[PDB]
């Protein structure tokens, strides 16, 4: 590289911040988005103890911290912590001053306006970027698949949203946003582990339960048969070693944790599972583009990485859909970073180069410029 | 007086022998302590190498599991397609 | 807030650094003297800017060295 | 420390023999003929001071750094200069960092074989390839072809 | 082989590195002088009446303010960089402190004082 | 040395007072902390007989004195005698007036407040020091090892306490203080020696029993096997010469005296041994720092100098702990003075130089300043 | 005779101190040697474990590559089916 100017494709997310320069294949730095103040007193003098460890540093000292995510469900609830996370991301994980780089944030659909306006105001006043643009997290995941149609189910860690798109024309009346995501699955797993004796309570042990969920849980092809099998044999019980020994054995908690996605009544949510909100999102579309959406169903986001979900979802939709249509579920192996790869592709386009919100435009219309033509 | 002279002589003899034994013991202690530090560093290096190898092994296990599941699913789909 | 407050503070500091230039009471010779003073001031500013650039390159080198040391610790 | 040798630079090793003259008053009568400096210090102590053998052992270990058991007069001089240090640690550590920056002209933060070899050539010292690998291992402690500021300082530890 | 020869080798390396540092510092000061002579617009003080002098002083003051803004930005960048360098040096100190603090014992009396006390005034080098 | 001002690192302890200037390797003067008034009448006139011999002087005239320790279990029970001990320590063993030297006392964890407040009031009013600071006896022992984590078992002569520390953040809810220590072992040894015929009763003969314990006793690797071996062969019987002749032969009393540490039921104490209070102290810590505490178990204090304890303790903890974790027991050869070496290191730090309790601060808030920010 | 007796007593005191020093140094040496033996055995076992883990990792790499190739072939077959 050299002259010229590259764009910063940041992607706030909720659970893992993924960032990197535009035009690559994978994000340069991926690290949890947690800011944890120490909670004990501290007796050693001169140890160089900081007041807040952010990012991946607080996943190693988590034994004496109180980690707290600054993004609850897509929306940002603690602006100071989010500013700290952004500052860390720019200066220590990429080491590029923001004064010389455009930024491309990402935002979930149907989010509060004030969140987006505050985001752009921060990026323009504190970090003082040249130009920033905010994009919907599902259109990027559709970019990365190299398609131009299809209905994308982006089940992140904060919020699961399902944006249908045809021929490049998004259908704003058919977006079905559901707030069940990876975090609720972690909490439900932590709640059902107590049925064997293992109690995880501290906010640090939520990370251990998350690791258990990632490494062991899988989505059952048929729920009742698995419940019957796990209750008779013992071929499912997989063991796992805690960060201090005392291995634990997970029985039928393995496929009961991610089953909450298809039956949100487990955690008390009323709505229908991710297998039926996709069909409802399709049926709201026009009668002539339903075949294409059926054939190009796209999966993205981290939580769709459970082993065996691309078959359960296809079976469910085939049960719901008319018998003639072909149901195909696109599940690329690079699912987790699909949104960021799409963001890199979009930022690398020449046609897109004039859509950025230039700073002089913000100076003339204020932060409310984001809702205007420069979307 | 003669008793005292004999006692002084034997005391001096045993004193010198004990001092030489003490010198030998101190020298042996120093040498073995240095060798122990060396072996301890070697043990630390062996431990870290084993840890890295086990981590890579676990990652490879996960990858093979995922890809084999994909193969099984695709084979079932191919049979249904025929 | 503070970021917009930081911008206002920066521009006000620059305005204060802007000297009150009045030439309605001085002859052309004193005008040339004031021009010489301003040229010496901009000479000092350029020297300070070059020193800052050199120290910034040194600090980038030290940052790279520290990153390499951290990677050694990792 | 350096002033002792500087004032004796124009003279030869006779000072050590002169030292033996003083030793001829206290510890004349050596038997082994090997490294033994604890006796002179202990006899010096026996003139009234509180007995302590740790300092004498530290002195007798400050000489042997080659590890072969041989202690030349140079090792005794190194013991003398490193027992009393005022402008040690290569004077200012800031100068050491500046010279390290000079070493890494590529600004990568890791010293490879080429950088250190070029600096050796600039110095031009005749050092054997075995000695070259000795220095490489002394600096590159983890032995991976890279040297950071800490490894360079450790290699240049006690080096003025 | 001999420790004194290796110490002399290390000292020669230090002196050579110091000489190269001085050479590069002379290069840097020459570059600074050349850049100062180039970037700074020379004072053309011939055939200028009052009004053009006022116009020139105004535009040069504006340019001085602009370059002062740029130099202030670079100064802020340098201050942030040195603050980060200090923070990371403290971090490395935390990662490499502990036992690396100098543990020194005063029971080892200075040999110079011992020789001076025992020998009167005939132990002068030490 | 010269100008400038050095700190006095005193360490009251209970059984041996260790003191010396900050920045050295070993304490300058180490002497028992006993004050013994004469008990007989005394007929020689003009012999220059004093009314109380303190320190190491009363270990040579102990034949006609009644030695009594002024510190029972960490706490100080006889303030006049403790003041006398401090006065001796400052003026005769170090010969430095306290008006020109900061002091750094040490105190066991979980001690009564009044003890600490009276200590600071004495140091500021009677001896009139410039500034004094009180530190917990375990953090110093962790300093001396050059670590920054680890759980330190500081089995002194008065009280055994077990303070776990991680990354410099002490865990106040996991300190397990047990009052079995060297003095109770001396009393138990003196009580089991009576099974062979040797009766020691006088408070002077307690010193002889202490010498026997120091020179002969050792900790058995396996208790039952040693009890069986000592009851059949005679390879263990080691003899010892009293201060007047009449050698004695210690049989299986050798490893039964220090076994009380691992089975406090011998002296009637209910609690569990030092092998199980360490494991309990670890298990109270968070689940993510247990591996580091397992790997960095530190021993300190005098009573942990028994030959063969660093193996018995490791065997016991390995039996208790999960099989995967590595158990390592740090037992430096300079165990006895570990607390004082750590105290010297702490007093020599530049970052610590502003934590002293300056005299003007005491004048403004009274002796209760010690519990405040200046801990 | 009395003066030489006093000096003999002093010599006996020195001999006793030498005895104590000798015993302490002997204990030091034996303890350090035993610890070194334990550390050496542990280091050897750790290195053997690391070698075994490396072999396992190599085998896992082979399996992963083979299954990846098979998966690609079946993906092409499924495209033909489509
Ligand atoms: N391999 C995996 N298996 C199962 N769940 C995973 C896996 N990787 C990540 N997750 C879940 O997905 C979440 C990360 O989702 P991510 O896509 O990073 O969210 P975001 O959209 O905020 O970036 C984690 O919290 C975790 O619960
Ligand atoms: N070499 C030794 N072997 C066995 N026990 C010892 C040894 N040295 C000291 N002790 C015991 O330890 C006690 C001294 O402990 P110490 O660490 O001085 O306590 P404090 O913490 O009060 O300073 C003595 O009473 C003695 O019983
Ligand atoms: Ca380099
Ligand atoms: Ca290296
Ligand atoms: Mg996402
Ligand atoms: Mg103690």
Using a CB-CB cut-off of 8 Å, the residues of chain C touching A90 are none
Give the integer Cα–Cα distance in Å for A104 and A8: 6
Strand F297-300, strand F150-155: pairing: parallel
Nearest CA in chain A to B59: A215
CB contact at 8 A, A317 and A327: yes
Q: A334 in ligand 1 pocket by Cβ < 6 Å? A: no
Using a CB-CB cut-off of 8 Å, the residues of chain D touching C66 are 109
Closest CA to A306 of A220, A238, A180, A192: A220
How many A from CA of E5 to the centre of ligand 4?
Answer: 26
Give the integer Cα–Cα distance in Å for A88 and A94: 9
CB contact at 8 A, G25 and B24: no
CB contact at 8 A, F103 and F123: yes
| Closest ligand by atom to F308 CA | 2
Per-residue H/E/C for chain G: CHHHHHHHHHHHHHHHHHHHHHHHHHHHHHHHHHHHHHHHHHHHHHHHHHHHHHHHHHHHHHHHHHHHHHHHHHHHHHHHHC
Closest CA to A347 of A86, A30, A11, A9: A9
Q: Do C72 and D107 touch (CB under 8 A)?
A: no
Query: Within F145-273, where are the H helices?
Result: 182-192, 205-216, 223-230, 253-256
Closest CA to F336 of F114, F27, F93: F27
Atom of ligand 2 nearest to the CA of F137: 21
CATH code for the domain of F62 = 3.30.420.40
Q: How distant is the Cα of E11 from the closest Cα of chain D, in angstroms?
A: 6
Question: Is residue F78 domain-shared with residue F15, that is, in the same domain?
Answer: yes
Task: List the domain boundaries for chain D.
Answer: 2-83, 93-155
Closest CA to E24 of F237, D104, A148: D104
Give the integer Cα–Cα distance in Å for F88 and F94: 9
How many A from CA of D148 to the centre of ligand 3?
Answer: 8
* Containing structural domain, residue C13: 3-73
Q: Do A125 and C63 touch (CB under 8 A)?
A: no
Question: Is residue F96 domain-shared with residue F211, that is, in the same domain?
Answer: no
CB contact at 8 A, F372 and F34: no
Number of structural domains in chain C: 1
Choose the residue to mutate in A302, A332, A337, A343 for probing ligand 1, maximizing ligand atoms within 8 Å of C-beta.
A302
E5 burial via Cβ count (<10 Å: 0-12, 13-18, 19+): exposed
| Residue A288, C-beta contacts closer than 8 angstroms, at least 6 positions apart | none
Count other C-beta atoms under 10 Å from residue B9's C-beta.
12
Question: Is residue F107 domain-shared with residue F222, that is, in the same domain?
Answer: no
Question: Is residue F125 domain-shared with residue F193, that is, in the same domain?
Answer: no
Closest CA to F13 of F98, F79, F92, F105: F105
CB contact at 8 A, D97 and E89: no
How many A from CA of F156 to the centre of ligand 2?
Answer: 6
Q: Write the CA distances from A55 to A62, A152, F170, integer angstroms.
A: 11, 29, 23
Strand A131-136, strand A103-107: pairing: parallel
Q: A157 in ligand 1 pocket by Cβ < 6 Å? A: yes
C12–D contact, CB cutoff 8 A:
no
Pick from C3, C6, C63: CB nearest A122: C3
Radius of gyration of chain F (CA): 22
| Closest ligand by atom to A13 CA | 1
Q: Is A302 annotated as a binding residue?
A: yes
Q: Residue A210 carries which DSSP code?
A: H
Give the integer Cα–Cα distance in Å for F179 and F194: 24
CB contact at 8 A, E73 and E81: no
Count other C-beta atoms under 10 Å from residue B49's C-beta.
17
How many A from CA of A369 to the centre of ligand 5?
Answer: 24
Q: Is A284 left (phi over 0), alpha (psi -120 to 50) or beta?
A: alpha
Q: Residue D50 carries which DSSP code?
A: P
CB contact at 8 A, A89 and A77: no
Give the integer Cα–Cα distance in Å for F85 and G39: 45
A126–C contact, CB cutoff 8 A:
yes
Using a CB-CB cut-off of 8 Å, the residues of chain A touching F172 are 40-41
Q: Residue F336 carries which DSSP code?
A: T
Q: Write the CA distances from A5 to A99, A133, A348, A353, G35, integer angstroms.
A: 11, 16, 11, 12, 61
Q: Is D151 annotated as a binding residue?
A: yes
* Containing structural domain, residue A67: 8-141+337-364
Count other C-beta atoms under 10 Å from residue F94's C-beta.
18
Using a CB-CB cut-off of 8 Å, the residues of chain A touching B73 are 310-311
Experimental resolution (Å)? 5.3
Query: Is F29 in a helix, a strand, or coil?
Result: strand
Residue identified by tokens 């949104």 is A339
C19–D contact, CB cutoff 8 A:
no
CB contact at 8 A, A142 and A77: no
Count other C-beta atoms under 10 Å from residue C2's C-beta.
10
Q: Which fold has domain D2-83?
A: Recoverin; domain 1 (1.10.238)
Q: Do A91 and E93 touch (CB under 8 A)?
A: no
Q: Do G28 and F307 touch (CB under 8 A)?
A: no
Using a CB-CB cut-off of 8 Å, the residues of chain A touching E86 are none
Q: Do F333 and G27 touch (CB under 8 A)?
A: no
Give the integer Cα–Cα distance in Å for F173 and F280: 12
| Residue E60, C-beta contacts closer than 8 angstroms, at least 6 positions apart | C35, C38, C39, C42, E41
Pick from B8, B28, B29: CB nearest G4: B8
Count other C-beta atoms under 10 Å from residue E11's C-beta.
14
CB contact at 8 A, C72 and D150: yes
E21–C contact, CB cutoff 8 A:
no
| Residue F317, C-beta contacts closer than 8 angstroms, at least 6 positions apart | F275, F278, F279, F294, F297, F327, F329
Tokens of F54: 């303190």
Give the integer Cα–Cα distance in Å for F74 and F12: 9
Closest CA to F185 of F219, F227, F224: F219
How many A from CA of A302 to the centre of ligand 1?
Answer: 4
Task: List the domain boundaries for chain B.
Answer: 1-82
Pocket of ligand 2 (CB under 6 A): F 13-16, 156-158, 182, 186, 210, 213-214, 301-303, 305-306, 336
Residue identified by tokens 């730095």 is A29
How many A from CA of A222 to the centre of ligand 3?
Answer: 59
E101–F contact, CB cutoff 8 A:
yes
Query: Within chain F, where are the H helices?
Result: 79-88, 113-125, 137-144, 182-192, 205-216, 223-230, 253-256, 274-283, 290-295, 309-320, 338-347, 359-365
Using a CB-CB cut-off of 8 Å, the residues of chain F touching G39 are none
The CATH superfamily of D93-155 is EF-hand (1.10.238.10)
Atom of ligand 1 nearest to the CA of A302: 17
């Amino acid at each position: 590289d050299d002259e010229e100017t590259t764009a910063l494709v940041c992607d706030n997310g909720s659970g893992l911040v993924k960032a990197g320069f535009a035009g690559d294949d994978a994000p340069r730095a991926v690290f949890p988005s947690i800011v944890g103040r120490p909670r004990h007193q501290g007796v050693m003098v001169g140890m160089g103890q900081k007041d807040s460890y952010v990012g991946d540093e607080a996943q190693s000292k988590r034994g004496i911290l109180t980690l707290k995510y600054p993004i609850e469900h897509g929306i940002i609830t603690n602006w100071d912590d989010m500013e700290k996370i952004w500052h860390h991301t720019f200066y220590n994980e990429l080491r590029v001053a923001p004064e010389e780089h455009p930024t491309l944030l990402t935002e979930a659909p149907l989010n509060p306006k004030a969140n987006r306006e505050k985001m752009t105001q921060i990026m323009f006043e504190t970090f003082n970027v040249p130009a920033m643009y905010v994009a919907i997290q599902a259109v990027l995941s559709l970019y990365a698949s190299g398609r131009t149609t299809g209905i994308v189910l982006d089940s992140g860690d904060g919020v699961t949203h399902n944006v249908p798109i045809y021929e490049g024309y998004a259908l704003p009346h058919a977006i079905m946003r559901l707030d069940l995501a990876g975090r609720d699955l972690t909490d439900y797993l932590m709640k059902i582990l107590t049925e064997r004796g293992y109690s995880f309570v501290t906010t640090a042990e939520r990370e251990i339960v998350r690791d258990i969920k990632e490494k062991l849980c899988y989505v059952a092809l048929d729920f009742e048969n698995e419940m019957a099998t796990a209750a008779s044999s013992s071929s499912l019980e997989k063991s796992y070693e805690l960060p201090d020994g005392q291995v634990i054995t997970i029985g039928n908690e393995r496929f009961r944790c991610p089953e909450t996605l298809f039956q949100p009544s487990f955690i008390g949510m009323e709505s229908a599972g991710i297998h039926e909100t996709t069909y409802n999102s399709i049926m709201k579309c026009d009668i002539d583009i339903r075949k294409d959406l059926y054939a190009n169903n796209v999966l993205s986001g981290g939580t769709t990485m459970y082993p065996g979900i691309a078959d359960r979802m296809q079976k469910e939709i085939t049960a719901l859909a008319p018998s003639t249509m072909k149901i195909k579920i696109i599940a690329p192996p690079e699912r987790k970073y699909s949104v960021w790869i799409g963001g890199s592709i979009l930022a690398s386009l020449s046609t897109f180069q004039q859509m950025w919100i230039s700073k002089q435009e913000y100076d003339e219309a204020g932060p409310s410029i984001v809702h205007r033509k420069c979307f | 007086a003669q008793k005292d002279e004999e006692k002084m002589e034997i005391q001096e003899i045993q004193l010198k022998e004990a001092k030489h034994i003490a010198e030998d013991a101190d020298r042996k202690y120093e040498e073995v302590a240095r060798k122990l530090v060396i072996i301890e560093s070697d043990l630390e290096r062996a431990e870290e190498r084993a840890e890295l190898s086990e981590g890579k092994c676990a990652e490879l296990e996960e990858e093979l599991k995922t890809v084999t599941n994909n193969l099984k699913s695709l084979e079932a789909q191919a049979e249904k397609y025929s | 807030g503070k970021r917009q407050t930081e911008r206002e503070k920066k521009k006000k500091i620059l305005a204060e650094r802007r000297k009150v230039l009045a030439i309605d009471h001085l002859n052309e010779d004193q005008l040339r003297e004031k021009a010489k003073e301003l040229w010496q001031s901009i000479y000092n500013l350029e020297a300070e800017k070059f020193d800052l650039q050199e120290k910034f390159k040194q600090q980038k080198y030290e940052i790279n060295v520290l990153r390499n040391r951290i990677n050694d610790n990792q | 420390d350096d002033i002792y040798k500087a004032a004796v630079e124009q003279l030869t090793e006779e000072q050590k023999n002169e030292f033996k003259a003083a030793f001829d008053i206290f510890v004349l009568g050596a038997e082994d003929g090997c490294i033994s400096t604890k006796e002179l210090g202990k006899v010096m102590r026996m003139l009234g001071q509180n007995p302590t053998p740790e300092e004498l052992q530290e002195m007798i270990d400050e000489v042997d750094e080659d590890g072969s058991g041989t202690v030349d007069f140079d090792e005794f001089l190194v013991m003398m200069v490193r027992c009393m240090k005022d402008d040690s640690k290569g004077k200012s550590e800031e100068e050491l960092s500046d010279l390290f920056r000079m070493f890494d002209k590529n600004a990568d933060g890791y010293i490879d074989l080429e950088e250190l070899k070029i600096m050796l050539q600039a110095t031009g010292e005749t050092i054997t390839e075995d000695d070259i690998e000795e220095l490489m291992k002394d600096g590159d402690k983890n032995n991976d072809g890279r040297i950071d500021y800490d490894e360079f300082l450790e290699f240049m530890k006690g080096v003025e | 082989i001999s420790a004194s020869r290796k110490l002399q080798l290390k000292t020669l390396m230090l002196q050579i590195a110091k000489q190269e540092l001085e050479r590069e510092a002379e290069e840097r000061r020459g570059e600074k002088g050349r850049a100062l002579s180039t970037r700074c617009q020379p004072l053309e003080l011939a055939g200028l009446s009052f009004a053009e002098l006022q116009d020139l002083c105004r535009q040069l003051h504006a340019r001085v303010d602009k370059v002062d803004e740029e130099r202030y930005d670079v100064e802020a960048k340098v201050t942030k960089n040195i603050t980060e360098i200090a923070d990371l040096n403290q971090k490395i100190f935390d990662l490499r402190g502990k036992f690396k603090r100098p543990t020194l014992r005063r029971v080892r009396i200075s040999a110079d004082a011992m020789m001076q006390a025992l020998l009167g005034a005939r132990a002068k080098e030490t």
